[PDB]
């Protein structure tokens, strides 16, 4: 079990840790979050009580170092930092535990939700999508745009997701125009899986990270990326059976964790009606189809 502590909470803010969240009042005695499960990436995220503009947060892996948060009154935000001195951190941390000024990462033991949402997400891949190599952790917020969004403006602050474009030379073999546009199997399997991602685990890690950034930060480009990665699989006639099975479980837990009041914006009608009802895989997503119908029959 690991701990992401705070120097203080000088402004009223709603603090999220993974799918959990709690309200902290201005200058309330809050010194951080303990009992954080080792083995997974995590995200700690913020929404100020006074300017709900900009949700922002930090992806991190407690294995990669000791990371704490101090409010910066000049830049106006809670920043993550990486301490390089052990002992002082553990001793102050012991003291913090001792004064019980920390909330406990509140994981029900029955609950596998976070694992299932982050199964293929690795910090190494996050850090290549979010480029800032002097930090072990990665900042993301509501407004950041993706590389592909920028093509159609500040590169240092971009989400460098893998570009998918169904009407592009990368996706369409000369001479197979109709074949490849109606059956994206060659774009999926040869171009993206074998060529760019190397395996389906790295494909799924990016898909999962894109969903999580869309859900937690309202990041529009991430939502587009999530749906594009789904559509590429659902529009391929030839998908390894193990990827189809795993994709069903992936999407099931994403739709399960989405707030019901956010469906209007984060879910793209066209992509889901095609994937579940009109596409090659219309019959291969039973668990995802079941929850979408019992929870979002409106969209369909």
């Amino acid at each position: 079990m690991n701990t992401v502590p705070f120097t203080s909470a000088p402004i009223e803010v709603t603090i999220g840790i993974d799918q959990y969240s709690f309200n902290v009042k201005e200058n309330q005695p809050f010194h951080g979050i303990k009992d954080i499960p080792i083995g997974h990436v995590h995200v700690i995220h913020f929404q100020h009580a006074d300017n709900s503009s900009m949700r922002y947060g930090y992806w991190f892996d407690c294995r990669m170092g000791n990371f704490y948060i101090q409010y910066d009154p000049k830049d106006g935000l809670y920043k993550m930092m990486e301490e390089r001195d052990g002992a002082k951190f553990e001793n102050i941390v012991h003291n913090f535990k001792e004064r019980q000024m920390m909330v406990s990462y509140p994981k029900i033991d029955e609950d596998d939700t976070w694992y299932n949402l982050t199964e293929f997400v690795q910090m190494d891949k996050i850090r290549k999508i979010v480029r800032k190599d002097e930090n072990q952790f990665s900042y993301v917020d509501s407004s950041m745009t993706t590389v592909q969004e920028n093509e159609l403006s500040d590169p240092a602050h971009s989400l460098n997701y893998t570009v998918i474009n169904f009407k592009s030379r990368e996706a369409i073999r000369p001479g197979h125009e109709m074949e490849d546009f109606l059956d994206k199997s060659y774009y999926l399997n040869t171009v993206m899986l074998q060529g760019i991602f190397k395996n389906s685990s790295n494909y799924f890690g990016e898909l999962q990270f894109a969903f999580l950034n869309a859900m937690f930060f309202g990041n529009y480009g991430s939502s587009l990326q999530w749906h594009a990665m789904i559509e590429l699989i659902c529009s391929s006639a030839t998908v390894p059976k193990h990827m189809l099975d795993k994709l069903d479980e992936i999407l099931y837990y994403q739709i399960k964790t989405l707030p019901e009041q956010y469906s209007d914006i984060l879910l793209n009608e066209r992509v889901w009606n095609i994937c579940l009802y009109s596409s090659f895989q219309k019959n291969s997503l039973h668990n995802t189809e079941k929850i979408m119908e019992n929870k979002y029959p409106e969209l369909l």
Partner: protein, 237 residues
């Protein structure tokens, strides 16, 4: 964006553009099988690719052999059309290639867009105009060359005959669309108007009769009347 009544004069500016109509590419008669089922039998079709400024018509004849052993032919026809239009463009010299291609049916957009990926600077546009180009097979010489073809074939015409020696492209296109609209709404009556007077002939190298300017005004009026009539006969007005 899309082409409509508002940006209508853009057709006659000096940017090269082509209309592409695919409504006569896949043509079938629907008949009964000995077992009382229904079957289609294809006949030769054509792609109608037209420069509205110059009248130049690239009539790509689609021979029924292209469909042999193929499935979902109506969908195939759109991709075949886009393949052939892309091949036409690649065959033209650079200075003759169009800057825009306007498809008459919106289902041609993605097929053509995908075939033209090598041409990022050629805009593929739809249109809100309901153009009567389907009636091109009511022009006798065009219909004759399609039905007689024994192999795939490209045949070049000027769909305006020599009209541009005396009238502008705008007026020529308006004349063409009126003629085609009449042939579409009542082919028989339209052909009666065009070929009634035994003294007016079609030159061997033309598609339409050799009307004087005054005769063209009379013809055009008669075509308007036919269209309005059928609009009455159809709607009971």
């Amino acid at each position: 964006g899309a082409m409509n009544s508002s940006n209508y004069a853009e057709l006659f500016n000096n940017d090269i553009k082509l209309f592409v109509d695919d409504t006569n590419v896949y043509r079938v008669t629907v008949h009964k099988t000995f077992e009382g089922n229904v079957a289609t039998k294809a006949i030769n079709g054509c792609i109608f690719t037209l420069n509205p400024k110059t009248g130049h018509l690239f009539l790509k004849i689609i021979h029924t052999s292209v469909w042999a052993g193929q499935k979902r032919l109506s969908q195939l026809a759109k991709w075949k059309t886009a393949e052939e239009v892309s091949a036409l463009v690649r065959s033209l010299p650079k200075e003759e290639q169009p800057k825009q291609i306007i498809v008459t049916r919106k289902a041609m957009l993605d097929p053509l867009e995908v075939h033209m990926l090598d041409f990022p600077n050629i805009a593929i546009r739809p249109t809100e105009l309901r153009l009567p180009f389907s009636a091109a097979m009511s022009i006798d010489k065009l219909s004759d060359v399609v039905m007689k073809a024994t192999e795939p074939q490209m045949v070049l015409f000027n769909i305006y005959d020599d009209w541009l020696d005396r009238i502008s492209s705008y007026t020529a296109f308006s004349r063409l669309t009126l003629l085609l609209r009449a042939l579409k709404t009542n082919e028989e009556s339209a052909k009666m108007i065009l070929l009634s007077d035994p003294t007016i002939t079609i030159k061997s190298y033309h598609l339409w009769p050799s009307f004087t300017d005054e005769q063209w005004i009379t013809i055009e009026s008669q075509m308007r009347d036919l269209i309005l009539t059928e609009y009455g006969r159809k709607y009971n007005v």
